[PDB]
Design a protein around this ligand. Structure first.
Ligand SMILES: CCCCCCCCCCCCCC(=O)O
Ligand SMILES: CCCCCCCCCCCCCC(=O)O
Ligand SMILES: CCCCCCCCCCCCCC(=O)O
Lengths: 242, 244, 40, 268, 242, 268, 40, 49, 268, 40
């Protein structure tokens, strides 16, 4: 017969191998493909859809209320509303979102992110907030004067319930690692901070609720992509399921 | 869109014999094939064959059988049943090989006051078996035919219900007086010995028993008339009538 | 719903080849309508 | 070669009020199957044929390997054999019961397994020889016998612990098709029940086995047969009773019924 | 020689594999194919042929008589004649038929079925019966008023001995499983019921047989197909045959 | 077939001072995702699209083998089986949780390993048989059982110590796509909780295993499944709570939170 | 950044083939802008 | 290298197999065929005598 | 290359009543075989040629492997050899007896098997060397011998427990065809009976075997030869008496008969 | 009944090739009618 030289890798089984194997039921003719709404071709189609951030993650807050960052009438000027370290890596508010649990499956990322906030106060209650993205290098802005030096947006409460803060892809790299792995020093891939401040103040009519809220949503933008699939660390098993 | 009118009357004429019927159920031609002679390409035996024609290609009527209340069914092996009757039998005996088709006419008349249903089947290679392997008198009963002992199993371990896959007609008294089947030759080889191999088995089985508008009931017989068709014989020698 | 296979037999004899993937159209009429005077 | 034949479809129907056209009315006495179609019995909608029929084709039905033989080689003799039939095991035999004549090729695959006296698997590496012994050839008497030279008889040699042996066989009968059933006798001037229903043209001989050196452990041969390039003629009522013997159709037939019984025909 | 990489599946033997193997007798020239009536190409050709139902499966009825459902002169109105659960799966009257034992070899089915009944009474005996197919969802019709609400046919005894009830393919699926497997919950694939009733009554002349019969036959229709071959559960073996 | 689709780019932007065009202002009540692009929020430079999106494609996401079954064959019986689901192990199950309907083919790879009573590896060479037992086919009771003839059921035979066994399977459902989730009951006239969320159309049967000779040592089968030729419809909020049972979605839900907690929302 | 693969399947059935290397372009709008009166 | 799947029958030796094997003396050039009376091509030529 | 030659056919015949043409009448004295055909002796029908003749072709007849040698390697020496003839085993030798001259190529296949002192199979893995030792080359005396360097002699190395070794050989004779028979002497000025019927041109030498390391167990070599690319001349009356010796045609010839005897020529 | 094989030899020497599948037509006359003055 034809002389051959089987080499290394023979009989090895690679889970990502792209080989054609024999069909056990060669004559089987499957049912037709029918029409079904919502076909998805790329997980990136899902990443581009806004999901609510579990932003109110203060110790002691139990579900659903974790989805609403509180805003209230102040008695002080230039006050802070929120701080969030921009990470797609484990633990944080960002990690449980649609974009975040999608990142649990990949090891590298790139692209711009978008944050849309919706105000929940009464129609008569007003306010102006400042949302800021601070590129990396140092720590979280201490005051609003420092925060306004970065990429920001000034939001005015009105008939338009929401505002969008675009967190542009500002990296030296092209790609960042999604993990903050301490052993491999992945904090090298630090992406900065997003902070929220009172620009004016939340002011209400007499007797109105002195506390309202902000619902933060997040989605990936069109220039966003993921690389290298890996396993979710939060999906575990201690025994076979039955 | 209609199923009974001029298909009820029929006349078949072969050689010097003609059969008529005034209550038929059309004619069944097994597998849609009409009897035919062996092709030059399919053939193997080199000698020029004997083609008897009218002397053998005609209708033969066997002894009638009475349809009784405890009757289980009857059967005849072909060519066995006719191997010793008339000019057909003579040719079958004198030759080592035979090939041929059949024209079968089963008849059973009663009255509009009776009710009963017979299943008439033409079974190819009906190899039989009961709780034990059959003896010569059961496998090749000759003109007298045989009787089913286990009709539900069709004497072969299969089923009466699934036997409709074989060429057949029904003689349902409220509808018909008889059945007519035309059978082509069937075998896995071109020709074969008439005394050692039975190609077809004619089976008649009562499925709905004979009942009447009284308890007595006159003798109601079943008669079988059969005609060999498009026959040819090879390997002429002395006459040999059975495989015993 | 129309599986078209590759013939290709590396051997000399026809027996060596794999199973025929061709579909011949069925004709039940030899069994369903074996009557001479066909009525519909 | 393409397998794209489809099942039939359904076209739209409307109400009928006809004093002439009556398809619902049949006459089963003719031996003909019903002529009525869905469309003529109910108001039907349109359905485009989307279903295939290849898995019910004669080729697909028989085209897969099944156990047909299972000879055991003892350590004392180091030699067995197998009479070539497909009548030893019921599954394949019952599949063939659907037809009277079948013409086809066969693909044999042989798997060898060694065991201990207590029938537990053991490790054993030798070469075995499978030799086709056709009718008239001399049969081997020992593992030593000169008949194993295989001057004319074909042979296959493979390792006990190597991949399965495998080969194809053409349609071999002296006849023009094999017969699953035979209403006749095996010989002339003989009328013995043991020779009724026996068609010698279907028996091509034996397969003889031996190890190339006296066997240390048992060794069992499982012979699988794949029917391919199939042609079938004359469908039969299939086998309903169990098979008792290898060379005839006898059955037990105690209770004359096949399906289950129930209290009333008017309730489940 | 030519560098190669044998992979997983090497040396494995799959019974449904479609490979070409060496011919042991390469020079053999077989006998010619001769003409034989009745060539079959698809088992569906057989499925389309009517076979008799073992319908009279009442406890105590022994063979051949099991093939004839009894009909008799009634003394009551709107009376019932028969009930059958529409299943191609084991045990039932349907399973021993041609279509039924063919289903013993497959695991899924689809298509319309046809039932042709032939009356066996005397020429002078008359009657009108109602045959009904009830799509799934509930139980067997309790009375004729309930049964007539489904798919039905009214049969008139006359010169035409038989009638046909078409059981149309009315399924949500496309394909149904042939089994009623309790472990996998295949009763999910339930197909309904067929019931038979007296529309009028069987009336006879004086002295005539007060009991006659109906012979039920069943076949698959042209839009019928089977999928996935499996083994027959009723064809067993306790030892090698000899 | 080429996988060269790219991510979007960035074009240059300048200062805006408009009393009409305001893209920063949204209204999330509509259910629509934000319309704002980088360019409309900051002065941006030009960036040519250089990044690919193939690793996030539905095919690439599912197209790799994962453990789905792991039956253990005991030495006393020499036979086990596996109910065909992808619900026994969490990793693959959670990947599928992203979609409601999925249509695909599967590639199974089976790795066999022998061990001692203390679960340490041992050397053992035999041939095992994997047989597909569809719903309605009779199940094997012993290593001996006649059901292993495999007359119709397909089977795969491979060595314990040989390369992994492997084969492909078409899209088999009676449905037009498999459902990862089902808001309904398995049967009519039945309302049992054990039958809620159970869609029988997804269960194609069992895989039965045995050794061709009584087993000397344990033998464990690891079954890997690769989803290929994938079509997905209707994305879902993925599974966040751990899986407790194989046939339902119950979760523990003690602390109602998913992400980590912190002292203040104003500090890390 | 444009991996073009070789089709080639040595088997009869489509199921036997390897994974589809083709990239279909995504359309997020079914999920991002499911509103009737589309505004930008 | 080229992905392959050796199957059943591998390493088996069938006496009627029609395979091409390596030549042990590849450069050998045999003596010419000379004329000899009575060449036989089929054993059937003998059977007919 | 196509093998489609057919057997002859039969055409129709009629009655003859001729006083001149008489084909039934022969004269065997001429040495010629009968001229009568079926058609001229009986009224014959037409038969279209449907039978092939390839299985009786000289190539098909010899084209299959047969045992021709079976040397045994002892553990003490770890070396044997085989004189290259096809005269050691009767089956192939008798097939060749049909012809006087044969020109052909050969395909050798060697199967090695290890055994114990009691001739039972044992496991043994080594590499063996088969060396062609042509007339004039020095013969090896030990497993150690320098002759195994194989500087010019060709050699084949294979494992004891690996697939069979195999190779082809051209037509090697100094003659123009091998002779199955020789009515002459091997040497000039010599008239010894041991040298009568011995044609040295047919003896190409020996095959020497050894294990690459001293043998632990027996080891037997089965040498199979397949004659291919065959040319045959001058058919002979084949061998009827059994073969007693390897290098001559002596036979026992006790009872001067070949077929069976019977009581009368007029009854069976 | 006309087995046509594939030549194809992967080796340099003719000896390496498989058996000749070609059928040469036989001529029995060298043995059946070796007479000079041929009569029929
Ligand atoms: C190695 C020599 C192979 C020769 C095999 C011939 C196989 C033919 C099987 C025919 C089975 C006939 C059906 C039956 O068993 O009744
Ligand atoms: C060897 C016989 C192979 C038959 C395999 C069919 C595999 C289909 C897997 C479908 C998984 C459905 C999803 C689920 O587990 O809920
Ligand atoms: C490995 C070296 C191979 C050399 C083999 C030459 C084989 C020629 C066989 C000739 C047999 C002559 C007939 C006879 O035995 O009388």
């Amino acid at each position: 017969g034809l002389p051959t030289k089987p080499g290394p890798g023979s009989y090895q089984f690679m889970t990502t191998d792209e080989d054609c194997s024999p069909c056990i039921l060669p004559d089987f003719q499957p049912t037709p493909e029918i029409f079904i709404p919502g076909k998805v071709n790329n997980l990136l189609e899902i990443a581009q859809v806004e999901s609510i951030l579990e932003a109110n993650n203060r110790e002691g807050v139990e579900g659903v209320e974790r989805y609403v960052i509180p805003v209230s009438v102040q008695d002080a000027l230039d006050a802070q509303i929120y701080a969030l370290r921009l990470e797609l890596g484990g633990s944080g508010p960002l990690s449980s979102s649609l974009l975040g649990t999608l990142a649990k499956h990949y090891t590298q990322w790139s692209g711009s992110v978008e944050i849309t906030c919706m105000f929940t106060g009464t129609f008569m209650t007003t306010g102006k907030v400042l949302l800021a993205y601070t590129p990396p290098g140092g720590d979280m802005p201490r005051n609003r004067e420092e925060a306004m030096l970065g990429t920001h947006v000034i939001w005015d409460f009105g008939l338009q319930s929401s505002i969008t803060l675009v967190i542009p892809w500002i990296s030296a790299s092209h790609f960042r690692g999604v993990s903050n792995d301490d052993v491999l020093n992945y904090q090298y891939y630090a992406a900065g901070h997003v902070t929220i401040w009172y620009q004016t103040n939340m002011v209400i009519p007499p007797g109105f609720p002195n506390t309202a809220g902000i619902i933060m949503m997040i989605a990936a933008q069109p220039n966003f992509s993921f690389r290298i699939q890996k396993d979710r660390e939060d999906m575990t098993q201690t025994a076979i399921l039955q | 869109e209609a199923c009974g009118y001029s298909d009820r009357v029929a006349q078949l004429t072969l050689g010097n014999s003609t059969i008529t019927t005034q209550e038929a159920a059309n004619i069944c031609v097994a597998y849609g094939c009409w009897p035919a002679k062996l092709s030059d390409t399919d053939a193997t035996s080199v000698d020029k064959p004997t083609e008897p024609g009218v002397s053998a290609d005609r209708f033969y009527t066997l002894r009638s059988k009475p349809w009784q209340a405890d009757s289980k069914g009857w059967y005849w092996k072909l060519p066995d049943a006719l191997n010793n009757t008339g000019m057909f039998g003579q040719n079958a005996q004198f030759h080592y090989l035979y090939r041929g088709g059949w024209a079968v006419h089963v008849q059973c008349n009663a009255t509009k006051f009776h009710q009963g249903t017979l299943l008439v089947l033409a079974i190819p290679e009906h190899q039989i078996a009961t709780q034990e392997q059959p003896a010569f008198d059961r496998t090749m009963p000759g003109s007298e035919g045989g009787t089913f002992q286990e009709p539900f199993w069709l004497e072969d371990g299969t089923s009466l219900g699934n036997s409709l896959i074989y060429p057949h007609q029904w003689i349902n008294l409220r509808t018909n007086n008889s059945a007519t089947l035309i059978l082509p030759y069937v075998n896995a080889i071109p020709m074969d010995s008439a005394i050692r191999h039975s190609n077809w088995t004619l089976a008649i089985i009562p499925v709905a028993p004979l009942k009447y508008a009284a308890e007595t009931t006159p003798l109601v017989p079943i008669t079988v008339t059969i005609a060999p068709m498009e026959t040819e014989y090879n390997g002429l020698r002395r006459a040999i009538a059975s495989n015993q | 719903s129309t599986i078209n296979y590759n013939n290709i037999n590396y051997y000399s004899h026809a027996a060596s080849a794999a199973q025929n993937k061709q579909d011949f159209t069925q004709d039940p009429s030899k069994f369903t309508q074996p009557i001479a005077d066909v009525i519909k | 070669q393409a397998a794209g034949a489809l099942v039939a479809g359904t076209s739209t129907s409307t109400h009928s009020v006809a004093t002439d056209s009556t398809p619902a009315l049949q006459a089963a006495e003719t031996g003909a199957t019903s002529t009525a179609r869905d469309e003529s019995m109910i108001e039907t909608r349109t359905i485009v044929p989307t279903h295939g029929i290849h898995e019910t084709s004669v080729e697909s039905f028989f085209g897969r390997s099944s156990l047909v033989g299972m000879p055991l080689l003892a350590t004392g003799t180091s030699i067995t054999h197998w009479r070539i039939d497909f009548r030893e095991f019921v599954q394949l035999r019952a599949k063939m019961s659907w037809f009277t004549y079948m013409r086809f090729d066969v693909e044999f695959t042989i798997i060898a397994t060694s065991s201990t006296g207590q029938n537990v698997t053991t490790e054993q590496h030798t070469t075995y020889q499978v030799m086709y012994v056709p009718p008239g050839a001399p049969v081997p008497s020992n593992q030593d016998s000169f008949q194993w030279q295989s001057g004319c008889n074909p042979s296959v040699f493979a390792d006990t612990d190597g991949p399965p042996a495998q080969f194809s066989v053409p349609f071999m009968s002296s006849a023009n098709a094999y017969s699953t059933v035979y209403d006749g006798y095996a010989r002339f001037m003989d009328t013995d029940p043991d020779r009724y229903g026996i068609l010698p043209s279907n028996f091509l001989g034996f397969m003889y086995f031996r190890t190339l050196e006296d066997a240390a452990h048992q060794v069992r041969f499982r012979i699988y047969a794949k029917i391919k390039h199939t042609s079938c003629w004359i469908p039969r009522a299939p086998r309903q009773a169990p098979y008792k013997k290898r060379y005839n159709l006898v059955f037990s037939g105690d209770s004359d019924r096949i399906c289950s019984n129930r209290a009333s025909l008017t309730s489940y």
